Amino acid sequence: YQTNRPETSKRLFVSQAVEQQIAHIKQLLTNARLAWMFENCFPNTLDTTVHFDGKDDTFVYTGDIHAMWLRDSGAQVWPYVQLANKDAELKKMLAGVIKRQFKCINIDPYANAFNMNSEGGEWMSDLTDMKPELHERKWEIDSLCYPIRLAYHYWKTTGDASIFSDEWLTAIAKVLKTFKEQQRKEDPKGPYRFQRKTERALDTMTNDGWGNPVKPVGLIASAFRPSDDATTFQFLVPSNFFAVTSLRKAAEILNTVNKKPDLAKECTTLSNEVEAALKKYAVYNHPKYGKIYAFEVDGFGNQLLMDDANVPSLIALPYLGDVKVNDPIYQNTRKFVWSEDNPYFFKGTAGEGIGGPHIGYDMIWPMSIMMKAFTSQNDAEIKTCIKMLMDTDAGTGFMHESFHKNDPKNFTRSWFAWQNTLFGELILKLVNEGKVDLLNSIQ
Amino acid sequence: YQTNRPETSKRLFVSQAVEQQIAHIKQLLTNARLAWMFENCFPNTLDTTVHFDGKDDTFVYTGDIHAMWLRDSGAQVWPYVQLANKDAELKKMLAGVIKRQFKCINIDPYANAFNMNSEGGEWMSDLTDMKPELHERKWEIDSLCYPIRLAYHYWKTTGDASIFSDEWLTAIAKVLKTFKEQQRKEDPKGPYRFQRKTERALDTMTNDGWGNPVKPVGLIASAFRPSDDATTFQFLVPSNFFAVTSLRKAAEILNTVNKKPDLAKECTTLSNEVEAALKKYAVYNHPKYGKIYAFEVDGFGNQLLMDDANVPSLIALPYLGDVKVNDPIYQNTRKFVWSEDNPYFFKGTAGEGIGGPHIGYDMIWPMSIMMKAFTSQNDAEIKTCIKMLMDTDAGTGFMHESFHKNDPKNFTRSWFAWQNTLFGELILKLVNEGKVDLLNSIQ
């Protein structure tokens, strides 16, 4: 099992703590293919996408899409944070990612994807207010949450509050401004409008670039989902849940570190407003499953019942920490989304799981199977998930965006560093929780 | 009030019976403005869009979109049928419209819009199987229903069954085939795929050209609506209702005229399947309004609650004859759609009514107001609607596609012959029902 990592000399960033963690997990695992896949995937972000300048900046590419997503970058380095106290260079690089993220938010808090400098690119032609520092300007609530999540974990783990600079203060004020704009209370249209001349229906917005109507009940409108597909009803439930938790983290930072209580209070009160509106509008009494969370709602009474593989998703709510895994409405939702009552759940000869309209019919995303494992309370279920992930990689040793339910050799995104990070993180979690016997029972 | 009709020498088709009807209504009406609008609108189709070859063919343009829609053409000559027994040339022309519609269906039963010959046009580059005889190929269930409706009413009025030729037999077989393909039972994708590179989200289809998934519960998928906007969930309820009725008319024709009892039974069997599925899936228990009809459903349990102005619409069900006007679920739906609980209902300084995502926020379609009048059981409501139509035409004396809720001078489609026909039809209906005194009470 020769590694599919790049040759040592070609790896973009090296962490001694990451290398020792990998050596350790390989030693513990008896399944040689699993160990090989772990080694391929866990460090892929560092091997292939990290540009650390040695000082205060880290730019992080997604993989086979050559720009930096706020979402991807916040996830791509997530499991490394727990190693930061053992590795000074790793710690500096992580602080650089967070500092870069806040600078990106400051450039445009509506934008999902950024260039390293001012290169422009193919989406300068989009019918929206573009700057050459942007790769793409799809408004996605979760773009602003992932950096807050990363920064909070980095701070709690390391005690290093120096990331909460004047650029952070500018950024978090932009986050509040943007979230409140997108409650669309005074104007159904507003400051964010997006169209693109494209054949892909979900890469442009309905109603002349304004999206489908919302009734302004307190939820935050998201123009696009974490899949980068346009929302159908703009009050995207998983992303609103993620906003609640992220604003509360922000409030704690603002009170404790910055002594900026007015901004903290604005975060707290907005979080409570969004949470109250989720309780009032995001629940659907399903005749089969009982009370479940809707995927998207419009505030008029429409509720879209589905899930999409991309995190934040319904199945992943407890992974991000937005609900407790025991939440009865979550457990009902979990049963619903992993069934043929979900329009984007697919089952065939090669496996089963959730995809979405991004790639279309019958294309299962490994992320959904990973999130089923992350949120499982049952060993047999976790084992089934891990074996499926091993048996649906087309022998590449990496995580893909999606694969066909009847043929894993038909797959999308060969080099998707967020997904590789998630797989490494999953295996590490399971080993650290004392479940190496379960993994070693895979023959 | 000088007429806005063309001068006599520029009128494309002249009917003696239509002129007699106009002169009769003008003499009965005492409101000069209303009489003027009637005269402008009722014959607009004949005046400006009809090309009858004197034999067996009539081509009918929409107005300011220079192609023939199966929907528009089937409605544009509808109110003239009742005059056909007294005007041989009008009769011949109507039979020519029908014959042309069956010819169109035989060219491509998935296509909405046709050229007179092989001119091609802007949409030849669409990502679908195009032919130069097509102006557009957006699959809309109602495209196949409007011709059957016209044909049945022409047959019942005139007794002329000569229109039900071998070309009809081919055509109705294609209708059955197409409807059944679009139940999507054995293949969730199927023979019809459509994308277009466009900034307009609803002018292309999701999921790589297949649209959003449907669970094959027996309903018929419509890729697009009568607005020409893509469906959100493909089992479009008003169109499925229209299909049931249209299939039963076709069964009657096939039994009585063509002596084809097996093909007739195939129509009836399908009608019964769609009807059963509408009962099981199309009803939503609205907490404010009671049981209502959903606008679109996917068969998985998703139901979209709204209405769009274009007929077939929810408000128009009794106009087309698909439900009785005192169906309790219909009456509940009627209250819901004409309310701010409908995302596409707008109220402003100029009036109120229903639009849709075709033209977008705040744009009300006169068709919705007309349909409210057509389906009204109250003289005062009827009078209010007629007054609103008169007060929202920007002084043009014609019916428009849409007008801004706060300013009727901001309007779309100055020359829209379907809409002009509907207005004439409405006024004629009210006079023929004995309600001229109501019309003459408008000051």
Ligand SMILES: [Cl-]
């Ligand atoms: Cl649009």
Ligand SMILES: [Cl-]
């Ligand atoms: Cl509060």
Ligand SMILES: [Cl-]
């Ligand atoms: Cl095993």
Ligand SMILES: [Cl-]
């Ligand atoms: Cl009056």
